[PDB]
Write a protein that binds this DNA or RNA. Structure first.
Ligand SMILES: Nc1ncnc2c1ncn2[C@@H]1O[C@H](COP(=O)(O)OP(=O)(O)O)[C@@H](O)[C@H]1O
Ligand SMILES: [Mg+2]
Lengths: 308, 220, 220, 215, 208
RNA sequence: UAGUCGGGUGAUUAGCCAGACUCUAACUUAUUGAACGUAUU
């Protein structure tokens, strides 16, 4: 049935879809992306044919996603995520280890079985095809090891779904004690105005993860960080200032001003100029007041010239 | 060599004791407590008798084995007789005395026993309510355990005729009695030692006012 | 040493250059290299090996390149495991070979009989003439004895013991099991010896005696 | 002072210890062990900081277990101060059982285990009391959770018992209180703090009783 | 790359070093100045502009500890408790971590020490593995250097990996920059109760 | 005190000025994929 649906969407024969899917878990290009400090991340992108199938699958089958899930959601982003926590003085950040590569077919099917909200029902015959659509085989020789890849277009949807029940439980638990909770992919954020309530959250998380996923998904204990208005607070790259307003941060603002000053004297190269323009669009989205200030500081004419 | 009575004098005045000798000796005592020697003698006597009947029945090929078994029997009887001849405490009693001493004197240790784990004999201890190996003990606990265990071993070996072998005579010298001990243990250490070893003359050195608070000025 | 290590064990390590003694004192590059090339027939005209070592704190490490030697040694090891082949001899005889002889010689532990004892201490500098004497005496004893007579004798003893257990003497069952184990071990050793395609002890002895007498002029 | 002599025909390091010239082998274990620590540390810093005017002002992390090991109380009062003076940019991470050592350190530097921990405590914290400049007896009780007087000694309770007897007999020395008074005097001595406290109790209680009678 | 250039010009040491390695003057001098710059305070003591110290330590199923966090002082931290509270365990954990810096200052890709699979895993831990996680600070240009040492118990079929690359990356800066032009290097030392020993002048070590 | 937030100045990722904050307690991250902003259409 999954095959018939895909064939219809992609205007292909059932036979050619089925044939393609036989080796689909191996149809991934592996490459490296430089980290911002030193080193590399390894990424696996599906081949074009497989990407099309994956997108078709996601289109055909709507999986439930909790409102606390901020990543990969239409009309939501890092701004919304940060804004959720801006009014609270105390902050806790937690992180899940090897999040995407921890999600296996076993976890996926368990989540389907367990799910409260209306999950699509799949015929047993379709389960094998679904696994081949959604999961990557990193090791050629080991056909048994299938995992989600961050690089696949279906992986965001599947990962959010797999966290649905987790999000339900923890969100409900936090709401009872007046803690705000959001998740951006593998990044968990908790905030509150009550002192000495966030300390219990890490223990609660560990128990819940064990309950739902056993040993498959774990907290990165090194990445658990407490913060307050005594210290720097940021959520997904956005600084929350002490006036409870979203900010780019002083250093980034100073850097942007530097680039504008360079532009004013015709010192910016084309690459840097393009960079500056892009960054200003982001600044306009997070902190529009900053753009107003730059207009005041640098002449509206200069800024318009830049953005033209 | 660790079962020989006068091994009790082996590097007694060297400064460290021989805690390694204790562990060997203690495991030895455990193995002997699980294995009765006279039943082995009775079993060996029965085996010798069975083998003698086979040799008398015309099977000359097993004569070499009979001679070996007779030798083993004679050795077992001799050991039994030597044990009988030594008037020495039973291995079970020896073990119990030492265990009690250790648990009484060393505050963090409530129990000590020998486990057979995999294919090797291992001494285990209940330390602060948790079961651990000797290698897992803190330095302070181990050092103090070592002192008491060594001393108890030697006293048991040298005082076989006493109901309580730890009430034997002797002179024991201890440098820096407070070595590695927290203040709480320093408040109990002299009392515990003197209670466990009532007829030993202790000559000790200390830098601890806490230790001195438990001792009469005449002793200082 | 890298050939010998890998003939003996998969992933075996040979010896390494010293950072202290092997690097030239005034080397600008602050590393040392020992490069060798071996020949093994026209199918393998070049087997390169490099041993390297860098000084402490240098910006780059200089590592040894040993893979070709390991690959070749692996062929010898693996093929030999399946079907016995002849293996190469490596030996170093330094001025240390001039040492006095211990007249008192060790009882046959049984390590000297094992084929890969031939690689023991082979690159140490002195040889092992003590090992020769032990091995040669062993060879003599085996030549004067018979092999399999012990098995036949053991077979006869196990048969006699089996008859005793069948006759109702259950006390000797433990001894039967021990003797069956000894018999199985003897057969296995015999079979392993048979499997290893090793020359008869008599022939081994003859070859060595002839070699010694041929090469050493004063010895007939 | 420390110096090398060769004149005997073998190289000997000598030190002036308490005004006497001795070999290293003749030092007490406490002196030698502490000397060893400092000598080793200084050597390494000199070797690793060739471009500093004072190489002992270099960077590093030094861990010391049981800093008070073999040290007399007098030395325990100096040891942390001396080390921090000599090595001002090293991060020291230390363990101790010594209240005397703690009396020389700020409370912010101290990390204390909870008294009945059982290895499930999530975060270590500093003591509530300020330790630096405090009396050793207070640190014993308030930080190390140990009585300043040994509870397992009967004589440690005599003053308390004496006071209770005095209060039971309307402040007058009865036969029982007199016996105990004499025991205190006999045991601790005529010039003891304990006897002075007993005397004080007698004086105060007599005066309180007189006031009560006047009323 | 332009991204590294921006970060490096912002004072990021790792970016500056990456640019130095790819081009192999400007960037070299940035790295060397980051390590060597400092000033003499009012008391006459030299103070490095970029300090190096351990900030935080986390222990998971390590010896007696199920999960423990310690925040350290930049200058002096004293740990107190009764015998058996794990004071020495904490120092051992730190010393093993520091061994990775020392190994890599001596030799590119050098190996530090490891947690014991016989003794170091908590006896009653349901997950049969242990983690020692540290974070080091090296000035505002390198605020966080995270290291994890991990070990699984001896029987266990899953094996838990250590994460030591950040230690190696920082140690590489010290080693490489020093080779080109001499710099001052950090001292790491552990003095445990083993420091009490008899002295023998007679014994000389002839190794190095 | 310190650290943090950051409105201003400053050929400007620096420095300096101003104001404010303090649960034991931020360490600024990743693409070509996904989502979001902007441009293009
Ligand atoms: N693997 C282990 N599992 C459980 N407890 C352990 C383990 N290893 C050691 N311990 C316990 O930890 C303590 C060791 O204390 P130690 O680290 O030496 O601290 P301290 O120096 O303060 O005594 C003892 O109580 C010992 O029983
Ligand atoms: Mg992009």
């Amino acid at each position: 049935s999954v095959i018939r649906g895909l064939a219809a969407v992609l205007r292909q024969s059932d036979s050619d879809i089925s044939a393609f899917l036989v080796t689909a878990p191996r149809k991934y290009k592996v490459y490296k992306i430089p980290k911002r400090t030193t080193g590399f991340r390894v990424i696996a992108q599906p081949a074009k044919g497989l990407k099309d199938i994956q997108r078709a699958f996601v289109q055909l089958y709507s999986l439930p996603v909790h409102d606390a899930s901020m990543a990969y959601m239409k009309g939501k982003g890092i701004r919304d995520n940060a804004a959720a926590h801006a009014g609270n003085q105390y902050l806790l950040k937690a992180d899940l280890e090897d999040f995407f590569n921890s999600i296996t077919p076993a976890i996926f099917w368990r989540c389907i079985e367990m799910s409260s909200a209306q999950t699509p029902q799949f015929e047993p015959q379709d389960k094998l095809f679904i696994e081949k659509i959604l999961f990557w085989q990193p090791i050629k020789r080991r056909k048994t090891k299938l995992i989600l890849s961050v690089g696949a277009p279906s992986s965001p949807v599947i990962s959010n779904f797999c966290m649905y029940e987790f999000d339900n439980r923890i969100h409900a638990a936090c709401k009872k004690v007046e803690i705000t909770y959001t998740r951006y992919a593998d990044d968990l954020t908790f905030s509150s105005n009550i002192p000495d309530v966030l300390k219990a959250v890490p223990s609660t998380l560990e128990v819940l993860l064990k309950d739902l996923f056993g040993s498959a998904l774990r907290l990165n204990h090194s990445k658990t960080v407490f913060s307050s208005k005594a210290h720097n607070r940021h959520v997904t790259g956005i600084t929350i200032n002490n006036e409870e307003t979203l900010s780019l941060g002083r250093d980034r603002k100073r850097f942007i001003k530097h680039l504008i000053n360079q532009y004013k004297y015709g010192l910016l190269d084309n690459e840097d100029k393009a960079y500056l323009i892009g960054l200003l669009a982001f600044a306009s989205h997070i902190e529009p007041s900053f753009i107003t200030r730059m207009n005041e500081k640098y002449s509206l004419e200069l800024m318009e010239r830049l953005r033209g | 060599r660790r079962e020989e009575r006068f091994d009790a004098y082996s590097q007694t005045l060297g400064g460290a004791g021989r805690f390694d000798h204790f562990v060997e000796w203690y495991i030895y005592l455990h193995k002997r407590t699980v294995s009765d020697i006279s039943s082995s003698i009775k079993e060996l006597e029965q085996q010798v008798n069975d083998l003698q009947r086979t040799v008398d029945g015309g099977m000359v090929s097993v004569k070499s084995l009979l001679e070996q078994m007779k030798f083993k029997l004679s050795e077992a009887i001799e050991r039994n007789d030597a044990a009988v001849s030594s008037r020495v405490l039973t291995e079970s009693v020896q073990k119990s005395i030492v265990e009690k001493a250790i648990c009484s004197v060393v505050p963090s240790i409530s129990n000590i026993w020998v486990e057979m784990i995999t294919g090797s004999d291992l001494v285990k201890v209940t330390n602060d309510g948790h079961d651990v190996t000797i290698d897992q003990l803190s330095d302070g606990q181990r050092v103090f355990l070592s002192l008491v265990a060594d001393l108890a071993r030697r006293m048991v070996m040298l005082n076989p005729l006493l109901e309580n072998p730890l009430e034997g005579r002797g002179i024991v010298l201890i440098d820096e009695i407070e070595l590695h001990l927290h203040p709480k243990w320093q408040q109990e250490v002299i009392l515990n030692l003197r209670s466990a070893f009532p007829n030993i003359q202790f000559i000790i050195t200390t830098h601890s006012p806490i230790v001195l608070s438990t001792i009469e000025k005449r002793c200082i | 040493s890298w050939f010998v290590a890998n003939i003996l064990k998969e992933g075996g390590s040979g010896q390494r250059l010293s950072e202290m003694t092997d690097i030239k004192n005034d080397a600008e590059d602050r590393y040392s290299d020992v490069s060798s090339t071996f020949f093994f027939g026209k199918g393998l005209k070049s087997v390169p090996i490099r041993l390297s070592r860098s000084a402490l704190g240098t910006a780059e490490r200089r590592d040894s390149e040993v893979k070709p030697a390991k690959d070749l040694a692996d062929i010898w090891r693996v093929i030999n495991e399946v079907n016995t082949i002849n293996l190469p001899t490596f030996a170093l005889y330094n001025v240390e070979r001039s040492q006095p002889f211990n007249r008192n010689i060790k009882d046959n532990t049984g390590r000297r009989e094992e084929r890969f004892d031939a690689y023991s201490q082979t690159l140490g500098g002195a040889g092992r003439f003590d090992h020769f004497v032990e091995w040669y005496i062993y060879l003599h004893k085996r030549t004067v004895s018979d092999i399999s007579s012990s098995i036949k004798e053991l077979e006869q003893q196990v048969n006699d013991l089996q008859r005793t257990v069948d006759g109702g003497m259950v006390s000797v069952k433990s001894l039967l099991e021990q003797m069956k184990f000894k018999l199985s071990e003897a057969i296995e050793r015999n079979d392993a010896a048979v499997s290893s395609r090793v020359l008869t002890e008599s022939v081994q002895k003859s070859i060595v005696e002839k070699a010694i007498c041929s090469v050493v002029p004063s010895i007939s | 002072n420390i110096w090398v002599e060769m004149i005997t025909g073998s190289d000997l390091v000598k030190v002036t210890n308490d005004g006497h010239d001795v070999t290293i082998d003749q030092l007490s274990d406490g002196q030698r062990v502490f000397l060893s620590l400092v000598a080793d540390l200084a050597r390494r810093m000199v070797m690793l900081n060739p471009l500093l005017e004072n190489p002992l002002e270099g960077r590093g992390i030094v861990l010391i277990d049981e800093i008070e090991l073999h040290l007399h109380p007098k030395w325990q009062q100096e040891v942390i101060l001396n080390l921090r003076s000599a090595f001002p940019n090293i991060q020291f991470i230390i363990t101790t059982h010594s209240p005397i050592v703690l009396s020389t350190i700020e409370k912010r530097c101290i990390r204390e285990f909870e008294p009945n921990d059982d290895g499930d405590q999530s975060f270590l914290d500093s003591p509530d009391m300020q330790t630096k400049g405090s009396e050793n007896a207070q640190i014993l009780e308030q930080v190390m959770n140990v009585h300043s007087t040994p509870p397992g000694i009967a004589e440690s309770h005599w003053l308390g018992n004496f006071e209770l007897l005095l209060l039971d007999n309307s402040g007058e020395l009865d036969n029982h209180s007199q016996v105990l008074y004499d025991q205190i005097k006999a045991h601790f001595g005529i010039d003891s703090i304990e006897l002075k406290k007993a005397d004080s109790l007698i004086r105060i209680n007599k005066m309180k009783n007189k006031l009560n009678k006047i009323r | 790359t332009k991204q590294y250039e921006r970060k490096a010009k912002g004072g990021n040491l790792l970016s500056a070093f990456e640019l130095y390695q790819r081009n192999s003057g400007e960037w070299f001098e940035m790295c060397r100045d980051y390590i060597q710059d400092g000033h003499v305070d009012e008391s006459g003591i030299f103070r490095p502009d970029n300090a190096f110290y351990l900030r935080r330590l986390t222990l998971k199923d390590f010896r007696r500890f199920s999960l423990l966090e310690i925040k350290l002082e930049e200058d002096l931290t004293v740990i107190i408790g009764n015998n058996g509270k794990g004071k020495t365990s904490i120092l051992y954990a730190i010393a093993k971590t520091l061994s990775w810096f020392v190994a890599n200052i001596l030799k590119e890709g050098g190996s530090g020490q490891r947690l014991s699979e016989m003794t170091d895993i908590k006896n009653d831990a349901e997950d049969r593995y242990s983690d020692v996680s540290s974070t080091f600070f090296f000035g505002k240009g390198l605020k966080s250097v995270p290291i994890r040492l991990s070990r699984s118990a001896l029987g266990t079929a899953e094996r838990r990996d250590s994460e030591v690359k950040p230690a190696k990356d920082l140690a590489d800066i010290w080693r490489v920059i020093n080779e080109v032009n001499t710099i001052n290097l950090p001292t790491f030392a552990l003095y445990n109760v083993e420091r009490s020993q008899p002295f023998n002048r007679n014994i000389k070590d002839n190794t190095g």
